[PDB]
From a paper:
The first 33 amino acid residues (M1–P33), T239–S243, S276–R331, and S610–A624, and the last two residues D895–F896, were not visible and were unassigned. The amino acid sequence of the VP4 region is present, but its structure is absent within the CsfrRNAV capsid. Thus, the VP4 is seemingly not an essential factor for virus transmission in CsfrRNAV. The full particles are more homogeneous and thus have fewer conformational variabilities. The VP2 N-terminal extension is visible only in the full capsid, indicating that this extension is probably important for particle stabilization, genome recruitment, and genome packaging.
Marnaviridae viruses are abundant algal viruses that regulate the dynamics of algal blooms in aquatic environments. Similar to the icosahedral capsid of the Picornaviridae viruses, that of the Marnaviridae viruses adapts a common pseudo-T = 3 symmetry with a conserved jelly-roll structural fold. The structural diversity of the Marnaviridae viruses that infect different algae hosts will be a key to understanding their host-specific transmission. Herein, we present both 3.0 Å full and 3.1 Å empty capsid structures of the CsfrRNAV.
Author numbering:
A (entry chain C): 388 to 609
B (entry chain A), E (entry chain A): 625 to 678
C (entry chain B), D (entry chain B): 34 to 238, 244 to 275
F (entry chain C): 388 to 443
């Protein structure tokens, strides 16, 4: 059953907090759609490339239209003496090119105390019933989310213009600066995020875009 | 500290629900509006034919 | 002894609450000082039941005004959805939403004497009219009236002073229409035509007027967003 | 045979109706073409129950933000009613009304480690404070805390991260307050003071933060008018 | 003047009926006399094939 | 259904009365059949022709 793919979580990437951060700075920005690629380069001695997708992203490739909700989970890796507060903002359409308010769009304020590992699910908030599925024309896909430490990308500027395939935009902003006992200017903190599919996920089409891909990436460069 | 241990089990079953974005409202008669039928089962999908390797 | 009215209203609350747009989560307890207000039945003087905030988009707005001269055949068209939503008064109350769904209501007011005996036609074209717009403008007015008479329309009589009420449904291939900045969806939902049917005359021994209003009903605003709406514009006439 | 759906919806109405702001009277009859919409239970997708138009003034807004340094005593004050009603987002939804009546709700958010052990005070002064404002600013901070502790206030603890909820009533010698342009009534309904109680320290072997929100509840907007509101202004911090 | 306003609504529902020319007299068994079947529905008619654009 | 076409009214044309008219003069004359054409000539700047018919 396809439900076994929509519901299998997966670790994607990490981003930093960098306590020497002002009260309103962008920490994370992503597009709400299941097709999020990850490209590696064969650490061992040869030249090879590959790509990875979450279980939700993998199962919607042979299809052309998708709809439903997606679930996100953020986990902060800090000690018992770290204090701070963060913000999560959702924009249904257009993107967030500038810092928004606190009640104009949907907002959430969460604090770093005795509890971590917050999760949130985004539902369908478009005027159309179904959206399109993202594809890639080459072996180096364009960036779909902003800094990810695994892929060696650290630009904090907001990317955009993917309205026809996505279900909005997620952003993470600081509210209260991170406090540490030792002292700043050299201290950071890492946050890990996971993606999933809500029980209302749906795909309905048939497509032939994967007709020339292959799972044999081992020796293809020569 | 109990809240930091229970939220560490695999699968994210100890995470805090956070009053999700909007609501879910889908009618049963949405397939009769779009695409005619559903595609929720991969076992049925794999019974179609595909061109391969003349 | 009486209540201390400072440390008689203190109480401790959880750090989790919601306000339909902002939700806060915390695990530490808070402190509350809740001072309640009075009933005061004499404090409600300017209380009516017409002006509200939910029923604000049902407020009529003048979108059209023309003066008719003797012995002339003319044609004039506007976009009712685009003009109404772009009014400066209406633009303010739709500023942090993304989508809209409502029905159009049009109303015409005529004024002419018993010495005029003229006639005019006012028709409406639903969604999809932009494709055949460069060619429809090339048809003579007489032949245009043939097609307009088969569509939802109204007839304006100048011998009397009567006519004009038009209820229109929401027809669209999507669920709502985007009203954010840069949208062209409102300017593609309908069209209003006002052309001469019979030229105006007069019994001598020289100008009539007409005014059109518009508003909406069963309005639904959804999808809060931090996006500016379509650039406001005062109606041309 | 089926209904003609053009001359099957025609009917004649009276020339008298009302729309809660515009009423028209006439003695001649009109003509109506009422085309009704469909039910479409599948047309409601982005439907929640938090974002509305009636409950728009209950949306929290950030009005204050400070950073606290070690070993310093300071004082800072703002006007909560004036800042909230002057926010650019809130100014748009109060634009054709004259009077308002609502209760204030304030909320503070603190964040400090277990190595800080500081304390701060936040007090509120009701209507009538403008008269004694040039003299109250001349009193030392220590003596100011004596009077603030007798008024509706809250205590901010830096060893923990807690505190801040304040419900305030509508106190005024009139029935409502004028919110039109040139009004000074909103800037005279209350005052918020934020001064040091005990200086902030730190266990070494250097900056804390604080944020204040505000909104309204049981809002009443009356007296429609064609008058612009108070000139909008972004909060200073 | 009431008679001039009611006769101005769209569709001509205020017009004066004028004792029409002759009468209508058609029997149910006229299709069995001419053409065999009826052509009153366009949805059925459109299910036939038409040559188009070799 | 074809009944929706037989029953949709349509404005065709106009004719005059011209009060300086004798007591028996012809004002209008037509054939009773549904195929009545109307030809126009593309008022705007080009040469184009077209025809129109009532819904019947």
């Amino acid at each position: 059953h396809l439900s076994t793919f929509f519901g299998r979580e997966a670790y994607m990437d990490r981003f930093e907090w960098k306590t020497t951060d002002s009260y309103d700075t962008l920490l994370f920005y992503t597009h709400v759609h299941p097709i999020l690629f990850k490209r590696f380069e064969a650490t061992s001695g040869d030249y090879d490339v590959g790509m990875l997708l979450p279980p939700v992203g993998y199962a919607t490739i042979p299809f052309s239209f998708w709809r439903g909700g997606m679930t996100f989970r953020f986990s902060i890796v800090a000690s018992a003496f770290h204090r701070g507060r963060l913000r999560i903002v959702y924009q249904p359409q257009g993107g967030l090119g500038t810092v928004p308010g606190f009640s104009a769009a949907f907002n959430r304020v969460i604090d770093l105390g005795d509890a971590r590992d917050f999760e949130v699910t985004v539902e369908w908030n478009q005027n159309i019933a179904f959206r399109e599925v993202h594809t890639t024309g080459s072996n180096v896909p364009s960036a779909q989310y902003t800094p990810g430490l695994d892929v060696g990308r650290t630009s904090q500027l907001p990317l955009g213009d993917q309205t026809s395939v996505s279900n909005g935009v997620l952003a993470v902003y600081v509210v209260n600066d991170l406090v540490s006992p030792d002292g700043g200017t050299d201290e950071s903190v890492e946050v890990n995020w996971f993606v999933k599919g809500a029980p209302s996920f749906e795909v309905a089409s048939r497509d032939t875009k994967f007709a020339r891909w292959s799972t044999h990436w081992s020796q293809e460069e020569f | 500290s109990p809240l930091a241990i229970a939220g560490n089990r695999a699968g994210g079953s100890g995470a805090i629900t956070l009053e999700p974005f909007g609501s879910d409202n889908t009618s049963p008669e949405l397939s009769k509006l779009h695409f005619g039928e559903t595609y929720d089962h991969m076992r049925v999908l794999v019974k179609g034919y595909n061109f391969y390797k003349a | 002894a009486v209540k201390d009215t400072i440390e008689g209203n203190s109480e401790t609350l959880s750090g989790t609450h919601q306000n339909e747009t902002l939700a806060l989560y915390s695990n530490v307890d808070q402190t509350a000082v809740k001072i309640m207000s009075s009933i005061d039945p004499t404090r409600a003087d300017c209380v009516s039941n017409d002006h509200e905030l939910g029923n604000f988009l049902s407020r009529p707005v003048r979108i059209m005004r023309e003066s008719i001269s003797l012995d002339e055949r003319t044609s004039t068209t506007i976009a009712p959805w685009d003009v109404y939503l772009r009014h400066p008064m209406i633009n303010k109350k739709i500023a942090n939403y993304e989508y809209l769904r409502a029905n159009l209501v049009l109303e015409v007011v005529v004024n002419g004497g018993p010495f005029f005996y003229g006639k005019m036609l006012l028709g409406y074209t639903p969604f999809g009219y932009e494709d055949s717009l460069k060619n429809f403008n090339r048809i003579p007015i007489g032949h245009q009236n043939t097609m307009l008479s088969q569509q939802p329309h109204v007839k304006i009589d100048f011998c009397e002073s009567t006519g004009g009420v038009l209820h229109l449904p929401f027809v669209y291939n999507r669920n709502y229409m985007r009203i954010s900045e840069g949208s062209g969806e409102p300017a593609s939902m309908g069209e209003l035509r006002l052309n001469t049917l019979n030229a105006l005359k007069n019994i001598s021994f020289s100008v009539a007027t007409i005014t059109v209003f518009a508003y909406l009903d069963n309005v639904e605003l959804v999808a809060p967003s931090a996006n500016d709406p379509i650039t406001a514009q005062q109606p041309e006439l």
